[PDB]
């Protein structure tokens, strides 16, 4: 083992990994959003910039896990990124709808962790969920709630998409 | 009776500490809409800070009342705080329809205290409601009446309503 | 349910809603006390000061958890606030006495929340009430526990109540 | 008559002259007071501060008077002012004691020259002693009751008075 390593279980260090390539794989799925929003027949450049800050989070919050595993002692092991699910999103709406049924699966995935850290008696590991992970996952999923309320409210196409757009400009 | 006590009279006393109650049953109210109009589902946060500011402006003036008591050496007595009328308040303009409402009942307590002060010859009491008081009451209902049209006018659901509450935001 | 709920228990919620009515009532008791000290028969400035400044803490938790009930998308329910249980608070000392007494009890509850929150597998809210409300609790106790200790010295009444008060404003 | 004076009643305008009096006289006492604090076989700085503050407050309200006798177009008539009732005070309580006693008898002339004003329908005397007086009066009455109160905690006399003369200094 690492002349680090202690009370680092392995089944904590393999899930750390599956949580690196669900970041990275966020992380494209929102660079894909970003792009498109900037496609000529498009031009939304809120939801542009809304989805690459996005996409810059999500690769951040991997990057993290990554001096995490170092941290401990556990060894990073690097899988393929699955291309994003879609190559166009749709409306403004369906996107942050998309957005928000992402970030409740890496909240999913984040609090199983949270649950197998707890099970192994890993209170290093169960505060860095708690205070670099879970806490920016239900702020990311209230602003998409109230982004998509506000969306509807201005009525989510036409003139409304456009001026919602301009509030995340 | 109190050695700073002069010529203030039980009754106004009395109806001071009623007034003292409604003023944060007042602020209750606004800051259950404050809330309100921050749920991931409502999402109006020009409302909310609007009802937030009206919240604590009544606490204001109830703390004012409190120091007013004991500057005429009447003692505050403090009654349970009802519950606000409501959970939930609807739309933007059911919700300043409502706060229309509560602030034209508020006024009318006061000018009674007025008249009661004024009853019993107490001209510190009809200064302090006119200046501290009844001014703020009338600029407060002006404001409401102006935002209940601007917001009929922008129209009051929808598109309009969420560009309106931006002016507030 | 709300589109942001997960991983968000009714019992929670509704423990939520407890909490925020009892820190409410916390926030009326030390408004309360602050006028109290404000008498011209009483006239103790520091603990006046004190006792609005702690009224002012316990309104601004029970906002705290008003904000996370929306943020995890429960619904808050607001109750009436209960009459302090005095009007009158008798001596410097026997009003931090009250205070020590309700902090406890707060922070009974507090700690009651978080083992309803840990038996449900919430840490997101475990970790809430630890970082935002046990720590402040435990600060509160022992800051007011020392406030008795020194008040106690400088012997509870007369000159010395007169000096303590000072050290407070 | 004055080219100015416009629903100026003569009774008002001899109660400003009796009023203008009784200020002075206050005046007076308060310096008698001032000094009396300065014997050397006295020495208390704070209180002889205060009083030479409040001296000159009431020297300045007797002022206001004169100059709003000229505004409405009355005649200031000066009497004689008498010797305050004592030469020496006794102790910083007796003389708090002999102020508040002073400050109520000026506030109840003070009312009754309003019930006077508001008898001839005078509102723009009435609001004179509103804002310019009535408020003061109140204010200082208080602040006297706030200062026994305190005096006689840190216990009038001895160490506690000596102490409580540094608060006012």
Known sequence: ASQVRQNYHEDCEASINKQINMELYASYVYLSMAYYFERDDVALPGFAKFF???????????QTFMKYQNKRGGRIVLQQIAAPSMQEWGTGLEALQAALDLEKQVNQSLLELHSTASGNNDPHLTKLLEDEYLEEQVDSIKK????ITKLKRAGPHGLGEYMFDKELN
């Open 144 to 147: 998409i709630g109230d982004m």
């Open 52 to 62: 690459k800050e996005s996409s810059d989070e999500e690769r951040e919050h991997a």
